[PDB]
Amino acid sequence: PIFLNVLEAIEPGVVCAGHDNNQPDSFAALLSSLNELGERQLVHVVKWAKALPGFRNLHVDDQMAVIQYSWMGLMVFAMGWRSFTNVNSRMLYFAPDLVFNEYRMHKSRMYSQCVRMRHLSQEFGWLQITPQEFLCMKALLLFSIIPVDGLKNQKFFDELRMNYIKELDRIIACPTSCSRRFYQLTKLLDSVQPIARELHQFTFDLLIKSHMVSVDFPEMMAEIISVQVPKILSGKVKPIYFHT
């Protein structure tokens, strides 16, 4: 099973936030550490995406675009899985050195969003998602958000996304049983998008007022949040839902 070999091989290992757990849980320290982690994760997402089967067939500008658009959803999805595997979704396992308890969820002013992310994490338990299903779903998530008036080479994108959907189908099939499962997984994938949108809105708002609340944004983060995220929030770039 070549495809699954590759997905396991390229999956990133442990990423630390660099969080000084000895300092008090303030808004500014928590979010500054979350932003540092976000950037470290983005670096890993780039290396992961570029090594995916077929990804290099995409026009290079489209390669950069889909990574930037999907980044937030990819991070949320993977964090949900870490949270499930490490702490049975009882807390948010952003990193080994940055695990959110209820106090941090409140102090970060992200409580409601954290609740939604914890619910996503719990889905991995409720649906008994396998590691293979998780990997294929995560790869599909990369191909689940595009500009409304299209990519530079939309046709190559459409073909690739089709092939990633087929691979998910094969993983399930490994007839009514398959059908039910595919429905459950596409529904789970759709459910990432509203959560990602809420995080996008929160992150954008935070960037705007960041100088006022003493929250640090790394330069590359600040670039993507100010250049790409508003394309999503203004509706120029939208998720591809399975279910209408």
């Binding site: 780039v46 570029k50 390669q63 950069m64 590359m220 670039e223």
Partner: peptide
């Protein structure tokens, strides 16, 4: 072009 720099650097 911070992101482009990273994309091409890796």
């Amino acid at each position: 072009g911070a992101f482009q720099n990273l994309f091409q650097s890796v």
